[PDB]
């Protein structure tokens, strides 16, 4: 019962992936310190892909073709997930992708653990418009997630009569010049909201930059689908506060399962690992992978797969399940606001988990 | 009533796009020489993008932003369609894409006229396996269509217990060396079928090359989703014969609507324009665009859109319609075999048009 | 005596390459209608690469590997020249590159006919600084020529205590948005000169755009190393006038060889082919290729090569020669100013042809 | 007196760059434990770019724009050096590049410490031909160094009547499939020598792979310009032995300066840092940077630059100097053979350091 961890230690998204890695190691701990899985202990392998799509392929190639791994939890950025996809499909292995993403994808061998666009962007567009205004400017890192993410957010804004003013993209490893030239565009745009699809290290940099270009008084909020406790941990409180984010989970949610997860993360995560929605997603996904295997009583992927769609888990965010119709998960959807002291303060929460709909057709979407 | 034609005149796919352009010009002729559309004549614009995704953007930018065009029929290769997509969405225009493609896409402003993978690959995989063998090797041009096309064909082969031996990719503008090194791989692979996703000019080159590496006697057939009368028109009869292709239409199908279309193409297409399935698709799509506008009595896109999904057309391939749930079309699916004298000889035809399912999940697919 | 013409007919730089193609066809005419070359007539082949580096490779592959061509005149953009380079080197063929370019290259099989940076940028930097100011902003198409061109121009400006304010790059096939966002940067920069390395079709677009952002009164001149009668032919007189350009030749230079070339171009070039410095370069280079072959009395490349470096030609721009130490040419260097009626008005001309120095080390450069 | 170290800790070339980093830290130690530089201690900064050209830019951006660094030693792969180049030129800083590379480059702000092609490939081609045969096959990582490196090696082989059979390229992060498909080509090629321009981690993998495809008996040697004690440290003795490499230095050379450097490296380098030619180059370059600054008595780059070209250093490889005509160094050139027990056994050594000639014109090259 060997699992392969594909989470960067270094690179643009190293902070969030490290939270993710730990969320997964915690799950392993608990499944192990519960007599493991059929009296044998589950053992994990880790390599650092450094956020590079080719190193993810290589690492997933290595794990599968040389250490005989058939179960993987990892990948953050979508181009990184796609590079590993063919590899898992070729070797019949299973990968759990505990992250938010643009949609319009299906792999029989990939379990989608974070929200598809109808699960985060759909609710979020409505909140932003019906609470802050209809003018918005899009700023994203320059890769496939941001671009496809904005594609549907554009559709979403048009549905609700809002207006996309500008669509700005910056390198994943951006220069201050790049940052300064985009912030200026975002300033002069005069929108009511800033929809950020900037990931990793440029997140904090971008938010600070925006703050600073606006000085004293009213500046639009920065809404994002990725910004977590990971990236907020790198910003000044004034810079961070007031910022919006949708995700299935927040370290501060009221409830016994969250606190259970929280007080356990605190007793296991290294100081440079924060507690985020993505660490929550890698935790539940890892549990489920073990639970299914106990139920099958084997570490065969077919035997474990079978049981994957029959196990509902009482995850820190609420009850989750994995639809077999498209391999995505029914997830909670919370829209939290950041404190003047940098805690996520939930403002809205869907009345029940949202079923996944990866092929996003706005008009056939439920109107929040 | 101004329509923008986005079809290459030069470049890798110039032959097929030229057939497409003419299929569309013919439709215009007929809608015009039928009192036009509200007594004004429909007028078309053409520019040659040369198969380059950036020149397609530029051309669609030009047509929309300077000649006030809101209706377009064109694009062949998927990366070319995607480059134009944002442009049509930004300006609220409509583009008809009369071509086969990989799926997993949605735009409110794009009408998908050629088959999605459940419409051609699904039936085709079954035919190839249940008629030629289960061993197959994939050879494609190196861009997004071939790669995503093979992704689902891999799933398809695994469903039916077949085997993908090798996945080979060659540049869109390939050198003989490139061609020779891939053909060798395809030879040594010893498959029962060659699934080609090679497009434009390298098509004929590839097929000839394969033929020639096999000399006298048994060589697997070459099945493709794109090869049409366009590319077969460039190959020797022995090279062409025996080759498989799935598409909604073939210039040689028995029926009064085909012959009607055929004997009219013959009286309008220049000698360097052949009659293909893709010219059939650009013809029906153009008709429908006019018909809807007559019905709306206006060249507004909202007014024409409305009526788009209510007009079933009796296209040369049979009855077609455009589902409003995902903007794709219900299409016929024929699997023809090439003559020793190079005519497509239909061997199989779906009992009714296949409804489109762009989000391809093999297990939930109908088993042919 | 077969020569291969590699000049785009369509695409970003089609206008200039068409002038180039004709400059070369004229040379052929004259060498032919002079009893040819050893009583056999020289025959040319042309294909349209459309400005795409891969199609140039393919075309040069085709010409060499299938029509047995060993002599080529063509290529414009540097990435296009580099794609063909390996091909000519592999097959021992000779290519004449009649164009300006960034330097830092050597091929035994390539004859460099247009200026290296010490031949155009060096003189030009001095003129611009010692005549207009020391503040400059760089705007270029986004490919290897513009970027390497600015690299040395930066060195050059630092030598003479000038200042590079901004370095802006736009796609080869740019959107008005792209154009508008760069012009704005160039406006707000407040430089004394605009150094353009924008090529093909975006040239006119850029110059017009700049003009228009400045309206009435003082706007810095636009200096370029490529802008020719080709691209000026697409601009309004007010837009064109006052603009600077360095090149070895201008259709309007005083002299019997220029007029000879001019009055002959006029009697041979189609109306959509202008008379430029680059058509002058393809003409002299083609002559020399013939002359050497007469002298060798053969169309062998070794035999013709030998004589290449011994033939000084009295080209329309003055006496030229091809140094065997690095395959580049000693060329004239004129800095012309554009008329209010759009004629290039030479303002400066080097006292003798400048010997080529492709490995540009500013400090060891002659100070103009 | 602050110096910025730009050497990967993780990624494709992490092993060699780590040897390089240590070679530089050692130099600092010695200049410091020699009363430093003007009684203040020289202090270094390090960041891990992970072999990614964008992270090198970012890191060099960070070091310069935020920690006020004006002196840098680092970069390995040429695309990584080029990404940092504009940055150092823009901020007037100095970078020492202690590595072998393709040539055809000049920056006033870059000190070239490893050999240009006339310094390693030129001698080496002669040795290989006049000692092993004239048939050769080229295998390289797919980036600018390998490709430009082979460009000149092709010229070199043609000069000496040798033959380039095949030119094969593999990703920097290659799959076994990629490795297996290239080794096969290299096997079937039947050359006398394998010229490798494969760098980092795929080096060992490639050599092992080749060995293993050849089994028992005669297989051509593997000559390289980069393979060092770093990459040989990852291979079996039988795999490593017999292999050729040219570089200015080898940890095993007879001489008091080498042993001095060696016995000091041993007392400072961590166990995962080997002693290589590139660690020798970063050591001498760092010394020189200090020495010049002592001489100028200041850490100004102009003041230090002045003295850079006047200080000849008695480096472990012999006497070195930095030509001010092109910023490259006069270096020793040794061709060593690997032991059956994996020590580099020098077989040839140039009679004096070779002066650098970055603009490589084979015919004007000295014939070894």
From Swiss-Prot, chains A, B, C, D:
Negatively regulates the expression of the aliphatic amidase operon. AmiC functions by inhibiting the action of AmiR at the protein level. It exhibits protein kinase activity. Homodimer. Forms a complex with AmiR. Keywords: Kinase, Repressor, Transferase. One of its GO terms (molecular function) is amide binding. It comes from Pseudomonas aeruginosa (strain ATCC 15692 / DSM 22644 / CIP 104116 / JCM 14847 / LMG 12228 / 1C / PRS 101 / PAO1). Gene3D superfamilies: 3.40.50.2300. It comes from the Bacteria. InterPro entries: AmiC_PBP1 (IPR039570), Leu_Ile_Val-bd (IPR000709), Peripla_BP_I (IPR028082). Consists of two beta-alpha-beta domains with a central cleft in which the amide binds. The keyword Transferase applies. This is Aliphatic amidase expression-regulating protein. SUPFAM superfamilies: Periplasmic binding protein-like I (SSF53822). One of its GO terms (biological process) is regulation of amide catabolic process.
């Amino acid at each position: 019962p060997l699992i392969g961890l594909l989470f960067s230690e270094t690179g643009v998204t190293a902070d969030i992936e490290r939270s993710q890695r730990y969320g997964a190691l915690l799950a392993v701990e608990q499944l192990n310190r519960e007599g493991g899985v059929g009296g044998r202990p589950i053992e994990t392998l880790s390599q650092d892909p450094g956020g590079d799509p080719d190193r993810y392929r290589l690492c997933a190639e290595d794990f599968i073709r040389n250490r005989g791994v058939r179960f993987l939890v990892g990948c953050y950025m979508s181009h990184t997930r796609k590079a590993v996809m063919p590899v898992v499909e070729r070797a019949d292995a299973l990968l759990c992708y505990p992250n938010p993403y643009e949609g319009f994808e299906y792999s029989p061998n990939i379990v989608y653990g974070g929200p598809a666009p109808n699960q985060n962007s759909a609710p979020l567009a409505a909140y932003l418009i019906r609470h802050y205004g209809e003018r918005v400017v899009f700023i994203g890192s320059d890769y496939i997630y941001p671009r496809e993410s904005n594609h549907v957010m554009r559709h979403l804004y048009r549905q609700h009569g809002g207006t996309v003013l500008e669509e700005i993209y910056i390198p994943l490893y951006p220069s201050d010049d790049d940052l300064q030239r985009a912030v200026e565009r975002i300033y002069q745009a005069r929108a009511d909201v800033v929809f950020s699809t900037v990931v990793g290290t440029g997140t904090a940099e971008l938010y600070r930059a925006i703050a600073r270009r606006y000085g004293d008084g009213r500046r639009p909020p920065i809404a994002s689908l990725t910004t977590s406790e990971a990236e907020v941990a790198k910003m000044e409180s004034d810079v961070a506060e007031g910022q919006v984010v949708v995700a299935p989970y927040f370290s501060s949610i009221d409830t016994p399962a969250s606190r259970a997860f929280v007080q356990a993360c605190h007793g296991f995560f290294p100081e440079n690992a924060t507690i985020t929605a993505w660490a929550e997603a890698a935790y539940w996904q890892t549990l489920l992978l073990g639970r299914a295997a106990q139920a099958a009583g084997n570490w065969r992927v077919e035997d474990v797969q079978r049981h994957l769609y029959d196990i509902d888990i009482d995850a820190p965010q609420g009850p989750v399940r994995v639809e077999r119709q498209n391999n995505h998960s029914r997830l909670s959807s919370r829209i939290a606001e950041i404190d003047a002291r940098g805690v996520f303060q939930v403002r809205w929460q869907s009345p029940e988990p949202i079923r996944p709909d990866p092929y996003v057709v706005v008009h056939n979407l439920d109107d929040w």
